[PDB]
């Protein structure tokens, strides 16, 4: 009793931004890519299931010469066991447990989910996490789920992609279409992260809450959160980098799914950094979004996503101020 | 109604050239490799189909240490829609539209197709092309096909793999075994390509025609074409590089497919560069070919391909003059 | 009549060693990874089969930034034909023919098989080998198998991953649960390998014998062998490297497979280098092993593997002296 799906997609994708767009939200040019993965689950006995998943990203916008591997990576690689009502345990490269909140708004046709950074403690995909999850409180409270996650230190060659040991968890409750969630994690920073000019402190912290309504073809969600010493940043003026001492983040989304397959979307996102060395307060992300995806069926879709960028041109860190529109065509299986 | 094929091959492949063969057509040594891809198509309704394809090359002749990734790349990555008789549209990394002509002779057991360079405007696979294709003139003229293709600028880190914006197209007509085709495209060159010592001008151009007979187990084809500022070249003496101001190219092939599975092949190819800075005229490619593939069935084959190289030893750009023979064994699915 | 299996596994894997473990057997930290491959065989006729295989390793312990590709590689890539009782021939990247002996002890839950180095002449996976194998002596002697293998020179950018031309072979005999095997190969060393400070001589040689009992849920095996100028080594003091002039190697393993799925393991391995320039004799590997794998079924397992490391802290080459324990969870298909 094993079921394994090989799965994947090919995404023709193009970004339009003015001139460069070295000063835009998303950039400019061909951004085509493809994903390949497997996900499998085996029924060991009536109460026990083993499972594994691996997912890889292959850029489609590189040449076949020396730059062939740019932006190619494993996204996920983990395996786990799930026991009757006791919970599931998995270990590997997987989603940070703060993403249990951030996933609420990470729903846009192309962009969005800006604070769910990869290899960034608990907000995005990350290496070496052991994750325990429980559904419906051991089978006793329908709708009430929680998780705890242990993050092992990754002392890598850059501060940006490193972390120390840490712990995080999440609790959520869902009831006839509504959902609420909170997630928090904290971890040591490594000596290399500390040596960065930007950000100061021995612990990283990230938290977020989420509210959503997801029924009757309507999708509405909001996320609010803060981080300490955890959001990666760069000052394009001094070419210095590191982490924001604090940030406060808000993300809102509203979508509707029409039976004929159109799914319009609007959204707002703002992330503001505070106590940044040599700057003080400074916006990281600030935009409105209008977009749509058209689903032809479960295997084919197309979309447009427009980021009306509200970052101003005198942003003190050099964050791009121009708009970006993406257009995509997607075959997936 | 989705059909997706995972497909691939493992190719044990060895090249024999004298000494190095640093001065040969093809080189020398192990050239084993494998390909993995998917290709999928979904029937959206009776008249509309969505489709996607991704294909990757994994060299099999690298070690498992630092050189593990040499020559590994995505070859194709695109998705598209095809509507009743109106045409097909796809976007991504795909074959340049001049390959609609060059494919006629790109038929040898191992070598051949020399002017179908990758990441070279319209002659080979290339990034960021939007391609429209029409079969049988909207359903009105059986056998008459055309295409137009829009190439978005790729300002990459090398001249060799860069291009500016451009447009190309092709028209072909097939009738009881005979086929004729023409294709032309033109594009801006980028500032980096212009700064190269070899080749001068603001536009690249490539064109080719093709004639073939493909029936009764016979395959015969010829391609003639020219390029301006588009064929990549190197002078091994001065170690300078760039593009040939002009080239003129001819490719001929003849093959026969015996029912017992042997498919012998002979061929001629010559590509000559003109107005090369500091040289004038100079051959790029000039050889005869004799070879065969033996098909055991649709999944297994073996072949030998011998390139009787007619480049002379005093070639002014340093183009290799020695012969090369390849021997391959292929399992594919 | 083609059968192709896509296959793979996701392995959550963690190593525990004291402090660094820069001075341990196995290291420390997340070592998660995934494998993807295909293996196919086509029945050409009643007596002839074609076959191909490709296998790749994707690390799961890298970040998605610049280090994304570390430790990623093709492990195997070859294709072949197998004729009735005459034998099989394949060419590509495959197991060196000395591994026909070393495979006997390469059976531990995580570690073990220490002398089966990759890209190391005939002991491990290697590029450009043509391998002929015969089962049951042409169909005439049940249980008696042999092989010969031709290794083409690989002049790569490092000594460690290079080799010259060579030949190796193996002969084995199996009879109601017992097996005996011998394998030997020799090859030229390349000029780059010769220029290394460690190891001196024009030929590499590697041989090994094996004995095993494999029946009634018992597994016992021993391997003994020697090498000349073939085992790669480093002196962490002088930061010099190359090959051991000689080594002598022994590997023992004993395991039991309980019907309920537990498979305990114990093992001993010692590899000693001799005539090392500026040192004389020096241990390379010396440990005992205790471990177990628990198989839930054919798709799911977990294991622990503990290396009681007997290398001392004053080892003259700087070989790590500390212990390592690994813990893994594996989903495979
Ligand atoms: S540097 C110099 C400037 N552009 C050329 C280059 O990278 N050319 C170049 C040299 C070797 C391989 C490729 C390529 O992308 O095929 C090529 C040579
Ligand atoms: S440079 C020096 C010359 N050859 C050695 C090398 O690259 N050796 C070397 C150092 C590290 C990993 C590998 C390898 O291919 O395994 C190795 C060390
Ligand atoms: S060097 C300096 C130290 N750490 C930063 C880095 O590598 N940062 C860095 C620069 C660019 C991409 C990444 C990354 O891993 O995303 C980043 C900048």
Curated annotation (Swiss-Prot), chains A, B, C:
Membrane-related topology note: Multi-pass membrane protein
Pfam family, any one: Porin_1
Any one annotated GO CC term: membrane
Record's note on what induces expression: By growth in low osmolarity conditions (low sugar or salt); activated at low osmolarity by OmpR, repressed at high osmolarity by OmpR (at protein level). Levels of OmpF protein decrease in a lon/ycgE double disruption (at protein level).
Record text on subunit structure and interactions: Homotrimer. Forms mixed heterotrimers with OmpC and with PhoE; other mixed heterotrimers are also probable. (Microbial infection) Trimeric complexes with colicin E3, BtuB and OmpF can be cross-linked and immunoprecipitated.
NCBIfam families, sorted: PRK10002.1
Name of the protein this chain belongs to: Outer membrane porin F
Source lineage: Bacteria, Pseudomonadati, Pseudomonadota, Gammaproteobacteria, Enterobacterales
